[PDB]
Amino acid sequence: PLMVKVLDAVRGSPAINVAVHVFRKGLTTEEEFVEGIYKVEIDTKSYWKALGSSPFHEHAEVVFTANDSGPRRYTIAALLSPYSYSTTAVVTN
Amino acid sequence: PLMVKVLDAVRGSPAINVAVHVFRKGLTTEEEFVEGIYKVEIDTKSYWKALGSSPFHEHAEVVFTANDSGPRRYTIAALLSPYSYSTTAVVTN
Amino acid sequence: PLMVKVLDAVRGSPAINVAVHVFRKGLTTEEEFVEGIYKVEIDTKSYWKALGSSPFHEHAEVVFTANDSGPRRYTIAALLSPYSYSTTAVVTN
Amino acid sequence: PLMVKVLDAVRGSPAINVAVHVFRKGLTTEEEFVEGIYKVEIDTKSYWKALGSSPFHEHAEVVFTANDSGPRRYTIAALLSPYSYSTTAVVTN
Amino acid sequence: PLMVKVLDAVRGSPAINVAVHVFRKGLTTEEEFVEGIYKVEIDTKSYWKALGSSPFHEHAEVVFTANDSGPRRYTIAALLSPYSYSTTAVVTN
């Protein structure tokens, strides 16, 4: 008899992230999974994923150049950071 | 007898993200999955995903150039960050 | 006997994101899935996804150039961030 | 006997996003899925998706240039962020 | 016996987004799906989707240029953000 209690009585003003998972019983194969319940991808890159069956098989002259550059600013305050009775400020003068 | 209790009694003014998942019983194969319940992708890039069966098979002269640059600003306050009785401010003077 | 209780009694003024999922029992194959219940894609890019069967098969002279640049500003306050009795402000002077 | 209770008694003035999903039992194949219940796509781009069977098969001289640039501003306050008794303001002087 | 209760008793002045889904039992194939119940696409672009069977098959001289630029402003307050007893203002001086 599964019997799960999470955050039953709450009095006040909290700041909560709740993730409750209850369970009971080709190139990429995925089966019966849970992914990225609270997932953050800010600057994620991916080149040439799962190209396929028999690419560039017989003859190929490939020039792969990946120039990642340039002025990029990522200013984040309280990433996945619940708060209460606090002061969060981003000041970019 | 599955019996799940989440946040039964709530008195006050909380700030909550609730994700409750209850369960009971080619190139890319995906089967019976839950993905990205709370997912954030700010600057996500992907070149040449799942091109297909037999690409560039016999002969190919490929020049792949991925120039990622340029002034990009991402200013975020309280990303996936519930708050209560707080002060969140983005000030870009 | 599945029996799920979420946020039964709520007194006050909360700020809640609720996602409850209850369950009981080619190139891309997807089957029996739940995706992106609370999903945010701000700046998402994708070039050449699922091109098809036998592309550029015999002979191909391909020049792939992906120049991503330029002044882009993304100012976000309280992304997926419920709040109560708070002060959220974006001030861009 | 599935028996689900969500937010039964609510007294006050909350701000709620509710997503309840109850269940009981080619190039892209999708089957029996739920997607994007609360999905936000602000600046999403996609070039050359699902081109088809046998494209550019015999001979092809392709010049693919994707110049993404230009002054673009996305100012958002309270994205997927329910609030109560708060003050949300976007001030662009 | 499926038996679902959502937001039975509501006293006060809430601000609610409710999405309840109850269930019981070529190039792109889609079957038995629910999509975009609360979906927002602000600036979404798509070039060359599902071109067809055998395009540019024998010989093709293709010049694909996608110049995305220009001054574009997207100012949004309370996107998918129900609120109560609050003050939402967009001030663009």
DSSP symbols for chain C: --EEEES-EEES--EEEEEEEE-----EEEEEEEE-TEEEEEEE--EEES--SSTT-SEEEEEEEEEE-S-EEEEEEEET--EES-EEEEEE-
Interface test with D, best of E86, E87, E91 (most D CBs within 10 A): E86
Terminal Cα distance for chain E, rounded:
58
Check if the beta carbon of residue B58 is closer than 8 Å to that of residue C57. Answer: yes
CB contact under 8 A, C43 and B47: no
| CB-facing half-sphere around the CA of C6: CA atoms within 13 A | 28
Answer yes or no: is B5 a known binding residue: yes
Chain D residue numbers with beta carbons less than 8 Å from the beta carbon of B70 are 69
Resolution to one decimal, Å? 3.1
CA dihedral D29, D30, D32, D34 (to 10 degrees): 180
For residue B29, the chain C residue with the least C-alpha distance is C29
Q: Which residues of A62-80 are buried (b: 16+ CB within 10 A; e: fewer)?
A: eeeeeeeeeebeeebbbeb
The Cα of B59 is separated from the nearest Cα of chain A by a number of Å equal to 5
Q: What are the phi and psi torsion angles at C80 (to 5°)?
A: 55, 40
**Burial status of residue E71 (CB atoms within 10 A of its CB: 0-12, 13-18, 19 or more):** exposed
The method recorded for this entry reads: cryo-EM
How far are the Cα atoms of A75, B56, B71 from residue B62, in angstroms, in the given order?
37, 9, 29
CB contact under 8 A, D47 and C47: yes
**Breaks in chain C at C–N > 2.5 Å: after which residues?**
25
Q: Which residues contact A56 (CB under 8 A, 6 or more apart)?
A: A62, B56, B57, B60, B62
**Burial status of residue A45 (CB atoms within 10 A of its CB: 0-12, 13-18, 19 or more):** middle
How far are the Cα atoms of A14, C16, E7 from residue C10, in angstroms, in the given order?
14, 11, 10
**Burial status of residue A1 (CB atoms within 10 A of its CB: 0-12, 13-18, 19 or more):** exposed
The Cα of C7 is separated from the nearest Cα of chain E by a number of Å equal to 10
> Token match 């293709």: residue?
E62
Chain A residue numbers with beta carbons less than 8 Å from the beta carbon of C84 are 13
Nearest Cβ partner for D16 among E16, E52, E85:
E16
* CA–CA gap between residue B75 and residue E21 (Å, rounded): 35
What is the DSSP pairing of strand E3-6 with strand D3-6? parallel
Give how far the C-alpha of residue D46 lies from the chain's centroid of Cα atoms, to the nearest Å. Answer: 14
Tokens of C62: 């391909």
CB contact under 8 A, B19 and A18: yes
The Cα of B77 is separated from the nearest Cα of chain C by a number of Å equal to 5
Check if the beta carbon of residue C59 is closer than 8 Å to that of residue D57. Answer: no
Interface test with D, best of B5, B11, B13 (most D CBs within 10 A): B13
Q: Which residues contact B18 (CB under 8 A, 6 or more apart)?
A: A18, B6, B7, C6, C7, C16, C17, C18, C19, C20
Compute the count of residue pairs across chains A and B with CB atoms less than 8 Å apart: 344
Q: Is E52 helix (H, G, I), strand (E, B) or coil?
A: coil
Chains in contact with E, where contact means 3 or more Cβ–Cβ distances below 8 Å, are C, D
CB contact under 8 A, A13 and C69: no
Give strand pairing partners of E83. Answer: D83
The Cα of C5 is separated from the nearest Cα of chain E by a number of Å equal to 10
CA dihedral C41, C47, C53, C56 (to 10 degrees): 180
Answer yes or no: is A39 a known binding residue: no
CB contact under 8 A, C84 and A52: no
Nearest CA-CA partner of A21 in A10, A32, A8: A32
Q: Provide the H-helix boundaries in D6-92.
A: none
What is the DSSP pairing of strand C83-84 with strand D83-84? parallel
Question: Which amino acid, B19?
Answer: A
